[PDB]
Amino acid sequence: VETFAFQAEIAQLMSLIINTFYSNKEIFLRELISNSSDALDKIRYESLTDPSKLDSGKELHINLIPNKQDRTLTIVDTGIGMTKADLINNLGTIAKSGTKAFMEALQAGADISMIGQFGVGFYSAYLVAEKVTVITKHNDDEQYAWESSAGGSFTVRTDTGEPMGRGTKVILHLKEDQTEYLEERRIKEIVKKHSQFIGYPITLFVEK
Numbered sequence: 001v002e003t004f005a006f007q008a009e010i011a012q013l014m015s016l017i018i019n020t021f022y023s024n025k026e027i028f029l030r031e032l033i034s035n036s037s038d039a040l041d042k043i044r045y046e047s048l049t050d051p052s053k054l055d056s057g058k059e060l061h062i063n064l065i066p067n068k069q070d071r072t073l074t075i076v077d078t079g080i081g082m083t084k085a086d087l088i089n090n091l092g093t094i095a096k097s098g099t100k101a102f103m104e105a106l107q108a109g110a111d112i113s114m115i116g117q118f119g120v121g122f123y124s125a126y127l128v129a130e131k132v133t134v135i136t137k138h139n140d141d142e143q144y145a146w147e148s149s150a151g152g153s154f155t156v157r158t159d160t161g162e163p164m165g166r167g168t169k170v171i172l173h174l175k176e177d178q179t180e181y182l183e184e185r186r187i188k189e190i191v192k193k194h195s196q197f198i199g200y201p202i203t204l205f206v207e208k
């Protein structure tokens with residue numbers, strides 16, 4: 001287990017998201033679905049010239065998995081997946097400018113829902129989650145677990161859990177007052193309202 005500090009700007013953005021009173025929290029789901037869609041686009045495109053890249057799984061889709069017992073909402077995709085360098089360095093590097101621009105926009109009146117326009121929508125997860133754990137697997141690389149409860153640091157480790165074929169699994173450990181996002185009807189509403197134009201199947205797993 002290695003522990004890292006977030007880039008300064010990103011840590012500041014996370015603090016703002018966590019501490020600003022903002023009722024329209026449902027936007028987190030659209031942003032995570034959008035990220036999955038981008039990752040799916042990437043593996044789809046790469047497979048067009050190298051179909052062996054789908055040996056780790058041909059289906060390109062997104063599953064939404066609420067679990068009231070664990071108080072978790074899981075967003076799983078079979079996209080390209082992330083490398084160790086993605087988790088430690090690249091995600092942060094490619095987000096820096098958008099983060100700075102988003103922070104400036106906020107100070108100048110813009111509202112939190114604009115976050116996705118700046119390419120940093122992931123961090124809206126912290127509107128509803130006290131901790132986010134992400135398992136990811138890129139071809140020809142190992143499975144990793146990323147995790148953060150904010151507060152300025154994240155961890156990365158090699159994951160010895162159940163093998164994913166390829167893709168990314170975002171596990172939102174929800175805040176006690178945010179359990180509405182574990183309800184079937186609510187998730188359906190949110191997906192229809194914000195994520196109706198995604199080129200991959202989105203499947204809601206109903207709890208038994």
Ligand SMILES: COc1ccc(-c2c(-c3cc(-c4cncc5ccccc45)c(O)cc3O)noc2NC(=O)C2CC2)cc1
Pocket residue numbers: 032035036038039040042077079080081082091119120122134146167168170
């Ligand atoms: C918007 O920018 C990005 C950056 C990277 C990705 C991405 C994901 C992915 C990432 C996040 C996510 C996005 N942002 C921060 C995250 C932080 C921790 C864990 C997942 C994160 C996620 O929620 C779901 C995913 O399937 N998987 O592979 C990817 N590779 C790329 O796309 C190559 C740069 C081309 C998606 C969007």
